[PDB]
Design an enzyme around this catalytic site. Sequence first.
Site, short mmCIF file in Angstrom:
data_model
loop_
_atom_site.label_atom_id
_atom_site.label_comp_id
_atom_site.label_asym_id
_atom_site.label_seq_id
_atom_site.Cartn_x
_atom_site.Cartn_y
_atom_site.Cartn_z
N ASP A 154 0.82 -1.21 0.00
CA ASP A 154 0.00 0.00 0.00
C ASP A 154 0.86 1.26 0.00
O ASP A 154 0.51 2.26 0.64
CB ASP A 154 -1.00 0.00 1.16
CG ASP A 154 -2.23 0.84 0.88
OD1 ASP A 154 -2.48 1.17 -0.31
OD2 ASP A 154 -2.93 1.16 1.87
N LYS A 156 1.98 4.73 -0.90
CA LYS A 156 1.41 5.94 -1.47
C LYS A 156 1.63 7.07 -0.47
O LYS A 156 1.87 6.81 0.70
CB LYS A 156 -0.08 5.77 -1.77
CG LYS A 156 -0.93 5.40 -0.58
CD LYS A 156 -2.36 5.17 -0.99
CE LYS A 156 -3.20 4.77 0.20
NZ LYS A 156 -4.62 4.58 -0.17
N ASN A 159 0.17 7.29 3.21
CA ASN A 159 0.59 6.34 4.22
C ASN A 159 1.97 6.63 4.78
O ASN A 159 2.48 5.85 5.58
CB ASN A 159 0.53 4.90 3.67
CG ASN A 159 -0.88 4.38 3.56
OD1 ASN A 159 -1.81 4.96 4.13
ND2 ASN A 159 -1.05 3.27 2.87
N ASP A 172 -0.14 2.17 8.21
CA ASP A 172 -1.20 1.46 7.52
C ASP A 172 -0.64 0.19 6.90
O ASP A 172 -0.16 0.17 5.76
CB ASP A 172 -1.95 2.31 6.51
CG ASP A 172 -3.28 1.67 6.14
OD1 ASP A 172 -3.44 0.46 6.41
OD2 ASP A 172 -4.14 2.39 5.58
N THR A 189 -4.07 0.55 -4.09
CA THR A 189 -4.70 1.76 -4.58
C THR A 189 -4.47 1.85 -6.08
O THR A 189 -3.35 1.60 -6.54
CB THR A 189 -4.05 2.94 -3.85
OG1 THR A 189 -4.24 2.78 -2.42
CG2 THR A 189 -4.64 4.26 -4.30
#
Length: 338
Positions: A154, A156, A159, A172, A189
């Site tokens: 994840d 990005k 985060n 996260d 995502t």
Amino acid sequence: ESVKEFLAKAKEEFLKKWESPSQNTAQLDHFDRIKTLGTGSFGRVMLVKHKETGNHYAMKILDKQKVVKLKQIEHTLNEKRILQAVNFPFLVKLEFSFKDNSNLYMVMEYVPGGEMFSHLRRIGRFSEPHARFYAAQIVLTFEYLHSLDLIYRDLKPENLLIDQQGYIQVTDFGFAKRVKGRTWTLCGTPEYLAPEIILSKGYNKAVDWWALGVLIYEMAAGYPPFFADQPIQIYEKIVSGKVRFPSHFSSDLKDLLRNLLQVDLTKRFGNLKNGVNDIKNHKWFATTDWIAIYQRKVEAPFIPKFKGPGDTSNFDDYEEEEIRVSINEKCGKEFTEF
């Protein structure tokens, strides 16, 4: 040998906690609620203050019934089991966890500087040195996680929190997983998904290195490389094998990004015989002192502005909703190990 012995000890320490996870180390009425810091479809993150010590924490609250409905049971168990077992300078620390009749709780260190996303959007883009400072921390963090057989899944800007020294703390772990070989779940995502996720293949840690290419591009350009109004349109661009670079990108940056944003996972930097060293030795990182970054001895590009450990100015405003605890236990069996 220094790196080998470091990672061997890191794995030993991770595995001991992985095999015997901590459970039930606080309870809700030990904390005062201060403010909602963010929200999602099955939980939210709260700023809380511990009533006895006065310390602030970020408390992630997950609604068990919503986790079940959105088929996130295994993912939430992954998140807590991994977070309680890892230890690295650029990973947010889990301080307590517990559950009650309705919710799961993960109480983490509170990082008042806010999300990289906010700072990136406020300044427009980061200079290459600034993006490189953050990228180096992600490279080392993925070297650590991948050596433990963990995939993060994840990456990005939302985060990545910016701490009081201007360094990154990754938060996260909702999609993180311990994986030997391949895994198959569609998650992430859209703008950050590697082609092999989109195409429903069995995939590996190479997806994290793809996502690093997306992140570096976004940090240096101000926008991600593959963008569109519908996810399907994003996915067509991702799988196409074409990316356009702004003219202000250095040649070294373009070269590194072509090798991270390599659609053929068997040719992607981070997934070749030399592993992470193809990235660490790339000319774009020639000025990076990897040990100094790890030791937090490099002066950061900027320090977020905040007044103290309880300041929420770098986070935004959300409707303040109740945290209700049912008089009856929900989904007890599903979350026994939490």
